[PDB]
């Protein structure tokens, strides 16, 4: 049956013949991520979908909570050292912010909860399991400047 895209299988053949390295792909993907050419992100940037409809619909489809900026404080809470792993630059680029730990889990406030690239970058850098809370992109961005 269907399993992988044609492009995935071509990249894999190239990797097996060592015409690509694992390292090439981490970099390509990083660049793809920074391009902002995802579908919803681009619709947003064109003015065609409000932050709120984006936020609400994302929450709803993924069965996630939606957190208002008024439900958070004006300084970061105390958090396990390795919210390092997370540069302020990374937070701004992907519009997300760690806002808490209860208990082993890191609460992550995120504008694009469908963005597995960014969520897996945070899982990896942090080594903590995540709990996802959706917010409006601008609210998250203001929080970031405000705390950091």
From Swiss-Prot:
**Function of this protein?**
ATPase component of the type II secretion system required for the energy-dependent secretion of extracellular factors such as proteases and toxins from the periplasm. Acts as a molecular motor to provide the energy that is required for assembly of the pseudopilus and the extrusion of substrates generated in the cytoplasm.
Name recorded for this polypeptide: Type II secretion system protein E
The highest taxon in the source lineage is Bacteria
Q: How does it assemble?
A: Forms homooligomers; most probably hexamers. Interacts with XpsL/GspL.
**First-to-last residue of the parent protein present:** 1 to 148 of 567
The record's family statement is: Belongs to the GSP E family.
The subcellular localization recorded is: Cell inner membrane
Disulfide-linked positions: none
**What broad taxonomic lineage does this protein's source fall under?**
Bacteria, Pseudomonadati, Pseudomonadota, Gammaproteobacteria, Lysobacterales
Per the record, the gene is: xpsE
**Which source organism does the UniProt entry give?**
Xanthomonas campestris pv. campestris (strain ATCC 33913 / DSM 3586 / NCPPB 528 / LMG 568 / P 25)
